[PDB]
Amino acid sequence: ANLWERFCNWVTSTDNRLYVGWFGVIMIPTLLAATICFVIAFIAAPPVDIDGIREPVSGSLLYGNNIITGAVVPSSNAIGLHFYPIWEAASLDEWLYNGGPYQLIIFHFLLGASCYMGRQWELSYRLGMRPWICVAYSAPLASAFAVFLIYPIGQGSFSDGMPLGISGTFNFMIVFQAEHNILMHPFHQLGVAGVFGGALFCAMHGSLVTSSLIRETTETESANYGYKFGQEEETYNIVAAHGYFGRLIFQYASFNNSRSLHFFLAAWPVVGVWFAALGISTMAFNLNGFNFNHSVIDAKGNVINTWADIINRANLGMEVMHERNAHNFPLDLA
Amino acid sequence: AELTPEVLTVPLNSEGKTITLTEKQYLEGKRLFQYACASCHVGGITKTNPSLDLRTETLALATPPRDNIEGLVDYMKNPTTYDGEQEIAEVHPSLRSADIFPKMRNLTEKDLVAIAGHILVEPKILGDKWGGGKVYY
Amino acid sequence: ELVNVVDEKLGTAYGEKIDLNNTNIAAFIQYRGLYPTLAKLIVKNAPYESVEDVLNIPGLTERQKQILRENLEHFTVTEVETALVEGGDRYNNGLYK
Amino acid sequence: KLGANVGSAQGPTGLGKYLMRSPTGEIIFGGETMRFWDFRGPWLEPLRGPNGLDLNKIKNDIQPWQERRAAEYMTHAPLGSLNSVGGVATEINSVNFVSPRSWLATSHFVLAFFFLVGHLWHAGRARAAAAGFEKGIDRESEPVLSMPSLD
Amino acid sequence: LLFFQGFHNWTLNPFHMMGVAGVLGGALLCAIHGATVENTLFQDGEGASTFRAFNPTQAEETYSMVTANRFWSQIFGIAFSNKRWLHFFMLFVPVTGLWMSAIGVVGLALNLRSYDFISQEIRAAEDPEFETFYTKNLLLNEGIRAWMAPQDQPHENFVFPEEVLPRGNAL
Amino acid sequence: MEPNPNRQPVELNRTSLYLGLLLILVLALLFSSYFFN
Amino acid sequence: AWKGHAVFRNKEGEELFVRRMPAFFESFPVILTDKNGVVKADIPFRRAESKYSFEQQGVTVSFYGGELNGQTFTDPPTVKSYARKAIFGEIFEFDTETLNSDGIFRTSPRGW
Amino acid sequence: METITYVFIFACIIALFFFAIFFREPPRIT
Amino acid sequence: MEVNQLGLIATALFVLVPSVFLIILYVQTESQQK
Amino acid sequence: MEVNQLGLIATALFVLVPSVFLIILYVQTESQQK
Amino acid sequence: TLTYDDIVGTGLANKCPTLDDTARGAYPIDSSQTYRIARLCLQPTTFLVKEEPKNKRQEAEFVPTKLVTRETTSLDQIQGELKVNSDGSLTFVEEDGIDFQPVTVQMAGGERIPLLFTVKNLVASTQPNVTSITTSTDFKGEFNVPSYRTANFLDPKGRGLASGYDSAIALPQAKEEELARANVKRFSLTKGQISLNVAKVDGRTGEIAGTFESEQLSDDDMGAHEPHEVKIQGVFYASIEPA
Ligand code: CLA
Ligand code: CLA
Ligand SMILES: CCCCCCCCCCCCCCCC(=O)OC[C@H](CO[C@@H]1O[C@H](CS(=O)(=O)O)[C@@H](O)[C@H](O)[C@H]1O)OC(=O)CCCCCCCCCCCCCCC
Ligand SMILES: CCCCCCCCCCCCCCCC(=O)OC[C@H](COP(=O)(O)OC[C@@H](O)CO)OC(=O)CCCCCCCCCCCCCCC
Ligand SMILES: CCCCCCCCCCCCCCCC(=O)OC[C@H](COP(=O)(O)OC[C@@H](O)CO)OC(=O)CCCCCCCCCCCCCCC
Ligand SMILES: CCCCCCCCCCCCCCCC(=O)OC[C@H](COP(=O)(O)OC[C@@H](O)CO)OC(=O)CCCCCCCCCCCCCCC
Ligand code: HEM
Ligand SMILES: CCCCCCCCCCCCO[C@@H]1O[C@H](CO)[C@@H](O[C@H]2O[C@H](CO)[C@@H](O)[C@H](O)[C@H]2O)[C@H](O)[C@H]1O
Ligand SMILES: CCCCCCCCCCCCO[C@@H]1O[C@H](CO)[C@@H](O[C@H]2O[C@H](CO)[C@@H](O)[C@H](O)[C@H]2O)[C@H](O)[C@H]1O
Ligand SMILES: CCCCCCCS[C@@H]1O[C@H](CO)[C@@H](O)[C@H](O)[C@H]1O
Ligand SMILES: CCCCCCCS[C@@H]1O[C@H](CO)[C@@H](O)[C@H](O)[C@H]1O
Ligand code: OEX
Ligand SMILES: [Ca+2]
Ligand SMILES: [Ca+2]
Ligand SMILES: [Cl-]
Ligand SMILES: [Cl-]
Ligand SMILES: [Cl-]
Ligand SMILES: [Fe+2]
């Protein structure tokens, strides 16, 4: 057993408190770098010329933000999709003025999270599990890729990537709605069905299983002590639960098969959020939401407004106001 | 409200002679306008030069006047600057420059008349929406 | 002490007529025969001590001089306002439809 | 055409309204399109010099075919709705247009993504099947039960 | 939705935010739980489609809690160990979230908004170089209100002349 | 992991709680004027 | 104190009325109409094509009652200021130093 | 002092991550 | 009066931190087997 | 910045009071026999 | 003889052309001919900002700064008239070109100074009797410095001069006096001075190159605060040609 052999054995060990793994060998350093840079930037970075018009936006705490307003501000529109590592800058001060931290953090993060998914496969394999947890995780990951990488590629600038902050996230959403009418896009609608539905089935499932807990405890103790970790007996009555649910809707809307049920629980939100991710990722190439502006006309030819037209008025407000100093020409073409 | 013959009656020439368009004429004019013009002139504005619109009052004050059928048809054959000083067929779609603006190629006199009629009738329907831009959307 | 000079200029003839010394060129579309040829000449040869000085622009045709004469009533002149004429704003003032 | 000196027109931000510099100095178009200065096209390159866009070529050498082409492309930008209403998201119905580039880009991003998912699915499944636990954990030989506690 | 953004600045409201956490967290739990059970199943049949190998009356758990726990302990650092707590928590997160959003909306009934940060406004009013995403989003809101109010609140008979409409350069 | 033999339970009886609370509160009543200044 | 009732007039002496702020709006434009609701004056955002500026329309304000009773103001800044206050209804003088007031509306105990 | 507060609360949360992971009550099979 | 603002937080913590300490000790003493 | 002066103590107490509560409960649980 | 693809991305596009050490000759000036500068290029290499002392009676120094807006700083493609005056001096009258760059430099401690680096409306003249331009020839002149932002620019609360709110709308019932300087936007217009020192002359080609120092005010944020005094030093290139 030479040294490389033992190194590989430790890396892939199923006994480490946290699994390292080969994916983890990339994950750990990239995630540490992204995290460290993020915390430092979020606390102390100077304002960032996000839209490349020498109009620097302050994102950090020390420069006048709170938790809700603060952000790591996207790199300059002057940079576009150009790679801006620290060593391309003349100085750290230039690097900061132009939003370098943003690129360091999002590239390291995306690599890191990709390896996080890989790692989920990897440990599933080392433990003799079936492998598809990582596929469930692909949905939020794909979303992150959508707002941090794909959308910037489609619009030609990381300055249009989502900001690393709460309010910056809202800014991103609002401008997105202006430029894509995302609410009227069936993929975003599927995404909403996914997360609303996921919340619903989450509560539903939780409540039904909780409802059918087999009595194992007294009134003066938590029912949870009624389940012992690793016990072979199922801790609730799935037949009683199925009976209740079938009666609540009708006999056949219900799952009596736990495997089929849990698969449904995985699939509904995962698929929905996949479609959300693809909504952002295809709206990245400006294939946008349904446009029914002035779709309904009377006999003379008067426009008869629908709610779609009111939406359009709102969108117009967003459009004309966003990045109020950045456009010189009448069409916002990216 | 409906699209009445009165609505469909527009100036044919500068001398104040009118012409009454058919509903068929109006609709074909709309179709042809969308096919050959709307890419720049959607809603009556001008995307590659927003300073000049297709409002009737604007066409009236153009040189020569373009607020009637023959003015507009003429423009579609031989477009000029707003003051009449320059002929701009080279950068503006016209029968004269249908060689470089191919969508103009198979257009008949009747077609141009229909387009002209669309341009004149539409503000009578939409009012300020026509040439008004996003403010009036 | 502190004054918005643009709002102020709106209280002069600048708010009533085409200021040959300040107004953005698109205003010349208001009247027959002025845009773009004469508009370009006028904006180019500004400023003018009086409206009638616009008749003296080098190269004007006789017909152009007639057209200008027809439109003196729609013109004015006021002091050149830096804020209105810097940035090439007389040719493009960031306003479209 | 209206008489502007486009090389010297200062935009509201202080950057040139029509022309500015890229981060490495090249003369490029101003406004948001500063992000797109890497663009190269047969209609634009005649105006290009060693230092980027050439002000003299811009003043003297712009042919009408170039104007035509720029107007055409400006008015056929790859922006449009799912029901093929051409233009920005707030545009009114009138133009039936969605660019082929949008259709092809979006279709193939969707397909490439679901194929990434497919790769994860069948790769993980292939590993699990080659090792013999793709159908679940053997109750009589549960691997984790033979591993020391994490803590 | 768009109205609540423009007039109430609803996204800035901590009760809405708790709502979002509850909903997205619920979705997260739904997905992660489903996937976990499905990928820690015991082999209880010979079929490669593993759905048939379950019996509703069976006394045994169909998946391994112990293996799932080790997996998540090593992936994420922590893991459920108690099934009862897991499922109760699946009730608790989205339900609590929706309740909080309800509280926020009750505030909005009175225009009792989380609309501004006063310190932000004092600084920005005094200092025309100070900018954050918060002030940017307020500009967006002002846009929404001005451009949508006349057609959205027709009973008010709003007439906003072009010149008063808030608009940035060119657009 | 094997248990550490040096562990000891800790105590605070009620009288000590009362004395302690009295000390803290009275110290606070004394020093607060100076904290406000 | 009540500053008195503000009456706005244009250069022609027509009485003008400031459009009041609805409770929904955190901020509101300044718009003045005649008795029939026709826009006669406003405070423009973009100036370049303004037609209704106070300067152009020669807007003045006269007060009746209250501290400003019998006074008229004609300089556009001041008239504009009082118009801004007019979107809030009747105009008042406030002590803002005593409490270090920040100028942002708060609800009453009815609200709370 | 606002900044100090934000950073303090955050720091506490990270410390808690540390204890909740490495000094958890270890799960035990029966 | 123009007091030190921190006075308040200073006083509050000054009371709460040690008091809490005591309360913790006391309570965990009472819960110990009798 | 011009922040609400009571923010600090409000936050401090917001953290400290319920946390302490939990800590008390936890510690007296651990001190119980078995 | 470089092309755009040789140049792009190198940083070279922001550099002015250079003359060899062989170019120390003289460029014959014929009073009868009419002259033009076909290309004036000014490449800044150093931005210095005058510190603003506390006692106001201590000598203020120009301190070094860090450029943070990258290689976007040079003036070029500037052309203008080259007049022969009665006393035999030459006067360059700037007609057109890329004759401004917004520049932001950063002072020790982090303060950022934006400025409109410019030679707009430059009029610069030599000493008399310049029979031939030599490495002893030089230009001195003045230029205009308009507001760093032009009139449409809106501040982060949407206030501006030619557009925007005219008040602080997030503070509806605040007293306006204390906010006047921020609410009422003002458009600056000042003067700068420049000296061009010819260090090299190729008399065959009429190409000259040398060093410059200009002085001007920095951005004043549309009247919100006081500008800073800036000194810009660098190299220049000009091609003289009879027109
Ligand atoms: C590479 C794939 C591709 C692309 C980019 C296009 C693009 C186009 N097609 Mg073509 N076409 C395709 C495949 C494609 N098509 C196929 C497979 C068929 C046979 C049905 C056709 C038959 C066809 C006809 C008859 C016509 C077109 C037309 C068009 C044009 C208008 C499209 C439109 O309006 O759609 C409308 C949009 C939709 C219908 C939305 C589709 C959304 C789908 C259902 C989402 C699916 C995502 C993913 C696959 C789902 C995975 C499920 C998950 C759970 C795993 C556009 C240029 C039109 C044209 O202009 O011709 C000149 C036209 O008339 N196409
Ligand atoms: C990250 C994205 C995100 C997420 C996850 C949420 C999440 C939420 N939003 Mg928020 N929202 C967002 C972004 C987001 N929002 C943004 C950017 C804005 C702009 C500011 C808004 C503006 C907004 C508004 C204006 C409101 C919300 C509300 C909510 C909550 C609604 C929960 C719900 O299910 O109601 C669904 C409704 C119910 C559950 C009621 C009962 C439904 C019954 C049981 C249905 C019966 C159906 C029956 C069978 C008939 C079927 C018929 C069929 C034919 C159709 C939820 C917390 C709502 C809220 O806070 O409520 C307090 C709300 O009013 N949001
Ligand atoms: C300006 C920036 C500067 C930053 C500098 C930071 C450098 C840190 C280097 C310090 C090295 C020591 C620390 C180890 C502590 C530890 O975790 O041990 C825990 C255990 C114990 O080690 C086990 O220890 C056992 C023996 S003994 O206990 O050590 O004696 C042994 O048997 C076993 O093999 C071994 O795995 O180790 C493991 O479980 C395997 C390694 C787990 C690796 C954790 C990586 C974390 C990645 C974080 C990604 C997210 C980032 C943000 C999250 C909020
Ligand atoms: C195949 C279509 C791809 C999209 C749906 C995929 C379903 C799985 C995706 C969710 C993964 C969650 C995490 C893994 C969860 C997990 O581990 O799954 C486990 C579950 C059971 O695994 P088994 O090993 O028993 O079966 C899979 C293979 O081994 C084959 O036997 O997988 C399936 O049931 C696959 C069913 C595919 C049958 C085709 C599905 C078609 C769905 C159509 C949806 C269209 C909606 C349009 C909008 C309305
Ligand atoms: C490579 C490493 C990657 C992981 C990095 C670190 C991840 C940290 C994970 C959370 C650690 C702290 C958990 C404390 C709490 C703790 O120890 O819980 C422990 C608890 C144990 O569950 P059991 O089933 O064992 O408990 C049952 C009975 O004991 C209940 O009485 O876990 C859960 O309840 C799961 C649901 C909570 C999930 C909470 C997730 C929170 C995510 C972060 C949210 C806030 C972020 C703030 C940003 C500033
Ligand atoms: C920066 C981080 C800061 C961490 C903060 C932690 C702070 C810890 C605070 C320590 C508080 C100690 C309180 C012990 C209080 C206490 O436990 O008393 C009772 C205690 C009796 O101890 P025994 O040996 O009897 O043991 C009994 C055991 O149950 C005690 O644990 O005596 C002492 O502790 C010695 C010192 C007594 C001195 C107390 C005198 C009080 C007199 C009242 C004075 C005020 C009235 C004046 C009127 C003029
Ligand atoms: C479609 C065939 C089409 C018509 C019809 C059309 C009409 C038109 C008119 C009547 C004018 C004059 C407007 C006025 O007030 O005097 C005018 C002016 C311009 N147009 Fe046009 N036009 C049609 C097609 C197109 C297309 C496809 C474009 C875009 C490439 C375009 C653009 C313009 C421009 C620019 C002008 C102003 C030109 C100038 O005065 O210098 N038009 N159009
Ligand atoms: C584009 C570049 C193309 C280059 C041309 C292709 C060259 C490819 C050469 C691949 C070499 C791989 O060599 C690989 O090395 C490792 C480590 O020694 C071996 O690993 C082996 O030894 C280690 C150390 O004892 C053991 O822990 C491990 O279990 C065992 O498999 C692999 O079994 C061997 O296959
Ligand atoms: C923000 C400011 C807050 C300040 C917080 C101060 C923290 C104080 C921590 C106190 C720790 C108490 O430590 C706790 O002591 C008790 C006994 O003393 C121990 O209890 C042990 O002894 C008792 C008595 O024989 C046994 O019944 C019990 O089974 C055994 O575990 C606990 O295992 C230990 O956790
Ligand atoms: C330009 C001079 C105009 C002076 C009159 C302003 C409107 S009135 C003014 O409003 C303030 C709130 O903004 C009050 O605090 C103050 O008491 C009152 O004087
Ligand atoms: C571990 C330290 C990481 C944080 C260091 C922050 C950058 S360092 C910081 O920069 C500021 C602006 O230039 C200066 O005002 C300040 O004096 C200086 O300390
Ligand atoms: O950067 Mn952010 O936002 Ca996508 O559009 Mn264009 O650019 Mn800008 O404007 Mn709209
Ligand atoms: Ca104050
Ligand atoms: Ca010299
Ligand atoms: Cl924005
Ligand atoms: Cl632009
Ligand atoms: Cl108009
Ligand atoms: Fe379950």
Domain CATH code at residue C81: 1.10.150.320
Angstrom CA distances, E98 to A200, E21, E26, E95, stand at: 10, 10, 11, 5
Q: What is the DSSP letter of E114?
A: -
| Cβ-defined contact of D68 to B91 (cutoff 8 Å) | yes
CATH (residue range K21-149+186-243):
2.40.160.30
> Residues G88, G91, G94, CA angle at the centre, nearest 5°?
105
Q: Is the CB of A51 under 6 A from ligand 12?
A: yes
For residue H21, the chain D residue with the least C-alpha distance is D151
Q: Do A77 and A326 meet the contact criterion of CB atoms below 8 Å apart?
A: yes
* CA count, 13 A, side-chain hemisphere, C24: 20
* CA count, 13 A, side-chain hemisphere, E148: 32
The type of residue at J7 is G
CATH class of segment(s) G1-106 = alpha beta
Beta-carbon contacts of E136 under 8 Å, excluding residues fewer than 6 positions away, are A57, A167, A171, A322, K156
Q: Do K206 and K17 meet the contact criterion of CB atoms below 8 Å apart?
A: no
Q: Which residues line ligand 4 (CB under 6 A)?
A: A 132, 135-136, 263, 266-267, 270-271; E 35, 38-39, 48-51
Range list of β-strands (E), A168-292: 287-288
The secondary structure element, H or E, covering residue A109 is: helix A100-126
User: How far is Cα A177 from Cα A175, in angstroms, rounded to an integer?
Assistant: 5
Q: Does residue C18 lie within any of the structural domains?
A: yes
Q: Do A328 and E17 meet the contact criterion of CB atoms below 8 Å apart?
A: no
Of H4, K108, E125, the closest CA to residue A62 belongs to H4
User: Reduced to 3 states, what is the DSSP secondary structure of residue A327?
Assistant: coil
The type of residue at H21 is I
DSSP K16-49: -----TT-B--EE--TTS-EEEEEEEEEEEEEEE
User: How far is Cα K241 from Cα K206, in angstroms, rounded to an integer?
Assistant: 6
Structure tokens at E103: 């509280």
User: How far is Cα E72 from Cα E64, in angstroms, rounded to an integer?
Assistant: 12
The type of residue at E105 is V
Q: Do A132 and E39 meet the contact criterion of CB atoms below 8 Å apart?
A: yes
* Residue A56: CB atoms within 10 Å: 26
User: How far is Cα C33 from Cα K233, in angstroms, rounded to an integer?
Assistant: 50
B128 CA: distance to closest CA in chain C (Å): 12
Q: Chain J within 8 Å of H2 (Cβ-Cβ)?
A: yes
User: How far is Cα A74 from Cα K180, in angstroms, rounded to an integer?
Assistant: 33
- Interhelix angle E133-152/E118-126, nearest 10 degrees: 100
For residue C25, the chain G residue with the least C-alpha distance is G48
**Surface-to-core class of residue E116, CB atoms within 10 Å of its CB (0-12 exposed, 13-18 middle, 19+ buried):** middle
User: How far is Cα E139 from Cα A210, in angstroms, rounded to an integer?
Assistant: 47
User: Reduced to 3 states, what is the DSSP secondary structure of residue B32?
Assistant: helix
User: How far is Cα E127 from Cα K222, in angstroms, rounded to an integer?
Assistant: 12
Q: Is the peptide bond before E150 cis (omega within 30 degrees of 0)?
A: no
Indicate contact of B with C: 3+ CB pairs under 8 A: yes
Residue to substitute from E37, E40, E42, interface D, most D β-carbons within 10 A: E42
Beta-carbon contacts of C75 under 8 Å, excluding residues fewer than 6 positions away, are C17, C18, C19, C20, C51, C54
Q: Do K71 and D25 meet the contact criterion of CB atoms below 8 Å apart?
A: yes
CATH of the domain at B66: 1.10.760.10
Helix, strand, coil percentages (3-state) for chain K, rounded to 5, are: 5, 45, 50
A327 CA: distance to closest CA in chain K (Å): 11
* CA count, 13 A, side-chain hemisphere, C41: 17
E22 alpha-carbon distance from chain centroid: 6
C49 CA: distance to closest CA in chain A (Å): 32
Residue A234 is assigned to a ligand binding site: no
Structure tokens at K127: 């000493």
Helix, strand, coil percentages (3-state) for chain J, rounded to 5, are: 70, 0, 30
Query: Which residues sit opposite A164 in a β-bridge?
Result: A72
Q: Chain J within 8 Å of H14 (Cβ-Cβ)?
A: no
- Number of structural domains, chain C? 1
Q: Chain A within 8 Å of H24 (Cβ-Cβ)?
A: no
Structure tokens at C58: 């080098």
Q: Which residues line ligand 8 (CB under 6 A)?
A: A 2, 4-5, 8
Angstrom CA distances, B47 to A27, D71, D128, stand at: 50, 9, 59
User: How far is Cα E74 from Cα A12, in angstroms, rounded to an integer?
Assistant: 12
User: How far is Cα G109 from Cα A92, in angstroms, rounded to an integer?
Assistant: 53
User: How far is Cα K158 from Cα K172, in angstroms, rounded to an integer?
Assistant: 14
Residues with Cβ–ion distance below 5 A, ligand 15: A 322-323; E 136
Experimentally, the structure was elucidated by: X-ray
Q: Does residue C80 lie within any of the structural domains?
A: yes
User: How far is Cα A112 from Cα A109, in angstroms, rounded to an integer?
Assistant: 5
Residue B118 is assigned to a ligand binding site: no
Spacing, Cα E116 to ligand 4 middle (Å) = 46
Using only C-alpha atoms, chain B has a radius of gyration, in whole angstroms, of 14
Helices marked H in K79-188: 180-183
Q: Chain C within 8 Å of B133 (Cβ-Cβ)?
A: yes
What per-residue string of b and e applies to A318-330 under the rule 16 or more CB within 10 Å gives b?
Answer: bbbbbbbbbbbbb
Query: B80-84 — which CB contacts under 8 Å span 24+ positions?
Result: B81/C35, B81/C36, B81/C37, B82/B52, B82/C29, B82/C35, B82/C36, B83/C32, B83/C33, B83/C34, B83/C35, B83/C36, B83/C37, B83/C38, B84/C33
User: How far is Cα C5 from Cα D6, in angstroms, rounded to an integer?
Assistant: 26
Instruction: Tell whether the torsion through CA atoms of G96, G98, G101 and G105 is positive or negative.
Output: negative
Q: Which residues line ligand 2 (CB under 6 A)?
A: A 173, 195-196; E 1, 4-5, 10-11, 16, 19-20, 23-24, 97-98, 101-102, 105
Domains in chain K: boundaries: 21-149+186-243, 150-185
Q: Tally the residues of chain G.
A: 112
Domain that holds residue C31: 1-86
Q: Is the CB of A62 under 6 A from ligand 11?
A: no
Structure tokens at K107: 């002072």
Which CATH architecture best describes the domain K150-185? Answer: 2-Layer Sandwich (3.30)
User: How far is Cα A159 from Cα A142, in angstroms, rounded to an integer?
Assistant: 20
F26 alpha-carbon distance from chain centroid: 13
Structure tokens at K43: 């490449």
Angstrom CA distances, I10 to B69, F31, F35, stand at: 85, 10, 7
Q: What is the DSSP letter of A149?
A: I
User: How far is Cα K226 from Cα K238, in angstroms, rounded to an integer?
Assistant: 34
Q: Tally the residues of chain F.
A: 37
Q: Do E156 and G34 meet the contact criterion of CB atoms below 8 Å apart?
A: no
Query: Which residues sit opposite K81 in a β-bridge?
Result: K36, K93
**Atom 4 of ligand 12, nearest CA residue:** A334
| Cβ-defined contact of I8 to J12 (cutoff 8 Å) | no
Backbone torsion region of residue D31, taken as left when φ is above 0, otherwise alpha when ψ lies between -120 and 50, otherwise beta: left
Of E140, D100, E165, G27, the closest CA to residue A177 belongs to E140
User: Reduced to 3 states, what is the DSSP secondary structure of residue A18?
Assistant: coil
I20 alpha-carbon distance from chain centroid: 4
Q: Does residue C96 lie within any of the structural domains?
A: no
Q: Which of A90, A96, A325 is facing K67, going by the closest CB pair?
A: A90
Structure tokens at J10: 């409000």
The secondary structure element, H or E, covering residue B77 is: helix B69-77
Q: Do F10 and I29 meet the contact criterion of CB atoms below 8 Å apart?
A: yes
Of K32, K118, K138, K137, the closest CA to residue K75 belongs to K118
Query: Which residues sit opposite K102 in a β-bridge?
Result: K116
Helices marked H in chain K: 4-7, 180-183
Of E101, E91, E96, the closest CA to residue E29 belongs to E91
Angstrom CA distances, G37 to A92, E158, G25, G41, stand at: 59, 10, 20, 11
- Number of structural domains, chain B? 1
Beta-carbon contacts of A307 under 8 Å, excluding residues fewer than 6 positions away, are none
- Interhelix angle A258-283/A133-145, nearest 10 degrees: 20
> What ligand 8 atom has the least distance to the C-alpha of A9?
27
User: What is the SS3 assignment for A270-301?
Assistant: HHHHHHHHHHHHHHCCCEECCCCCCCCECCCC
Q: Do A206 and E92 meet the contact criterion of CB atoms below 8 Å apart?
A: yes
Domain that holds residue B25: 1-137
Indicate contact of A with H: 3+ CB pairs under 8 A: yes
Beta-carbon contacts of D39 under 8 Å, excluding residues fewer than 6 positions away, are none
| Cβ-defined contact of K158 to A46 (cutoff 8 Å) | no
* CA count, 13 A, side-chain hemisphere, E53: 18
User: Reduced to 3 states, what is the DSSP secondary structure of residue E89?
Assistant: helix
User: How far is Cα K19 from Cα K4, in angstroms, rounded to an integer?
Assistant: 20
B38 CA: distance to closest CA in chain A (Å): 15
User: How far is Cα K78 from Cα K98, in angstroms, rounded to an integer?
Assistant: 6
Using only C-alpha atoms, chain I has a radius of gyration, in whole angstroms, of 16
First to last CA, chain J: 53
Query: Which residues sit opposite A236 in a β-bridge?
Result: A213
Indicate contact of G with H: 3+ CB pairs under 8 A: no
Place of tokens 């133009």: D95
Q: Do K28 and D42 meet the contact criterion of CB atoms below 8 Å apart?
A: no
> What ligand 7 atom has the least distance to the C-alpha of B91?
30
Q: Do A288 and D82 meet the contact criterion of CB atoms below 8 Å apart?
A: yes
K176 alpha-carbon distance from chain centroid: 37
Torsions phi, psi for F32 (to 5 deg): -60, -40
Q: Which of H6, H22, H30 is facing A231, going by the closest CB pair?
A: H30
To test the pocket of ligand 6, the residue of F8, F23, F31 to mutate (highest count of ligand atoms within 8 Å of its CB) is F23
| Cβ-defined contact of K147 to C2 (cutoff 8 Å) | no
Torsions phi, psi for A49 (to 5 deg): -80, 75
Q: Which residues of E touch A326 (CB under 8 A)?
A: 168-169
Binding-site members of D for chlorophyll a are: 104, 115, 118
C7 CA: distance to closest CA in chain G (Å): 7
Q: Do D124 and A134 meet the contact criterion of CB atoms below 8 Å apart?
A: yes
Strand K62-64 versus strand D27-29 pairing type: unpaired
Query: Which residues sit opposite K201 in a β-bridge?
Result: K24, K208
Place of tokens 């996204």: E11
User: How far is Cα E26 from Cα A200, in angstroms, rounded to an integer?
Assistant: 8
The type of residue at B65 is P
| Cβ-defined contact of C32 to B63 (cutoff 8 Å) | yes
